Design a binder for this molecule. Sequence first.
Ligand code: CEF
Ligand code: BB0
Length: 254
Amino acid sequence: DDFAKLEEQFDAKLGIFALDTGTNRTVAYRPDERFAFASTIKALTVGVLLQQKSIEDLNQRITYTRDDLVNYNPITEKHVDTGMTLKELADASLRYSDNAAQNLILKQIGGPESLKKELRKIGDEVTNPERFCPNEVNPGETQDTSTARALVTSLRAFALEDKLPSEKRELLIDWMKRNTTGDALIRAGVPDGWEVADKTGAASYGTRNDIAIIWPPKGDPVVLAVLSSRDKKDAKYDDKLIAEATKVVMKALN
Ligand SMILES: *C(=O)[C@@H](NC(=O)/C(=N\OC)c1csc(N)n1)[C@@H]1N=C(C(=O)O)C(=C)CS1
Ligand SMILES: CC(=O)c1ccc2cc(N(C)C)ccc2c1
């Protein structure tokens, strides 16, 4: 099988789940195996934020300090002086994977415990938010992990089904469509011209993730999660694994 070949080729473990929402055909490989979700959780966090707040309430200015800056703060490091609105924080979190922005958003929705509660409410019993900035340690722990199947199901719930009213659904989808961080991942494995909404993640042990909604020109979208990890803490990743895995998925569905 082509997925086993890629694990071999890239010295990594792959978790794959894809759902064609038109046919209900699926493509699965280790679909229920846990991986650190890393920044992919930002998408679900905004889904919860959008459930909590009116669109107008997203204009609430959030102030923060240099103390709130963490490992990677591409947008938030530029606005300590003014703060940023919740809307601008959601834009930073989703389109740049600004870690500080995610932290600020999580703080506003009541932290990981509160995020976990709201995910459970949409039917997600697997995803396990435990900490702000989900933190190295060891593989095996279920804290800050999910599965390809659960991330697909939760992303679909927010973005395409009924967990958000349509105007808020529109905001989430648009931010994800205009992601700047996933050019070499799922987007690189999809046919040209086909619109993609995605959120990437990356983490130690060579963890490299992308979750996405992919629209054919015409017809119902596919929802895909491609998760990966490696056995060494210091191992880096290769984006090409995710792109190639996506090509395998598209071939199996198309
Ligand atoms: C999201 O995944 C986030 N990742 C991290 O901050 C890291 N771990 O999170 C548990 C991390 C960065 S470097 C390292 N060894 N671990 C931000 N997301 C992306 C992304 O592409 O989405 C990054 C590339 C890094 S920073
Ligand atoms: C945002 C944050 O609090 C945080 C904390 C510890 C981290 C450790 C890392 N490695 C050991 C690689 C990487 C990112 C990290 C981010």
